Amino acid sequence: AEYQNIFTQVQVRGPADLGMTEDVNLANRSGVGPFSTLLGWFGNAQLGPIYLGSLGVLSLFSGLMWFFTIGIWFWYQAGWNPAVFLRDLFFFSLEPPAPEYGLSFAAPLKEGGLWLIASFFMFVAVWSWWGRTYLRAQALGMGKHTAWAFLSAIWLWMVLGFIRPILMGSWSEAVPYGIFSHLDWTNNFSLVHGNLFYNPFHGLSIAFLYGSALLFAMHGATILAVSRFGGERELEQIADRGTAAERAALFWRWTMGFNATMEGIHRWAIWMAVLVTLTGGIGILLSGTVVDNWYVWGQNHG
């Protein structure tokens, strides 16, 4: 039973860590949360603190305003009946305007006027929450990576619910709020467009998604394997390269003929993952707008 470093053996706790200051307005940071011994076996034990400015409070509010809007229509669909609600939870759905209401806000409440409400609330929560990721990095004087990368995810989401519905002339094209129903919309989309396996961006989106799983697996395991030389202390290995960083690079060099640096590998990571929704969102945007059938397009423009 040689130890492996997947679970902690001995946890250790000291004074609750209020974290670095730099230019953060501390009046908005909260108080430390409890201390999960459970979480402690895998990562950090300390819940909290959490920053919460005005932008942050807007975001958190309108996010729930979204979530509830969907929920009350799920209750209406249940006939206000607790047992029905629970039985049919995956089955309920808040669909957008029929195709005839075009891009207008005229549509009756009970036929996707409600969908547009929750969507507005969603749009607010996400974009506000986006700026939040920028500002927290600004406050600490750090790079804007997090916010750049999050925008790539926003791209797909913007395309599915906003940009593609705008370009195609109606709100009906957009994903419904509902577990089983948005799953169906997905399958439907594919059918209506000649099968997305013929969308070269869908293929890439996949390559990268699999690739994200390949890389993070490679990397994650690499670090654990060199953690016997304080491998996980990545920032300091960048600043003053250790045996950990060296035997890492060398496992990979010796296996597959090239390798990474302890900073570089993270550029590999951020790009791999970001390219999932980057290519993805392009693939979706082009569908319906320019290409009506991917099989057909595939036959001509090979």
């Binding site: 070269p200 961006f201 890439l204 390269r241 960083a245 690079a249 090239f258 390798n259 990474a260 640096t261 302890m262 900073e263 570089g264 590998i265 550029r267 590999w268 790009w271 290519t279 392009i282 082009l286 320019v290 290409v291 397009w297 423009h301």
Partner: peptide, 26 residues
Amino acid sequence: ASLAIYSFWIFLAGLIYYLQTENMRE
């Protein structure tokens, strides 16, 4: 779509170049 895809395959090679040079700092 035929443009966008050609455009990508190029972008990607530059990215791989960038990445690979970036990982030569040590």
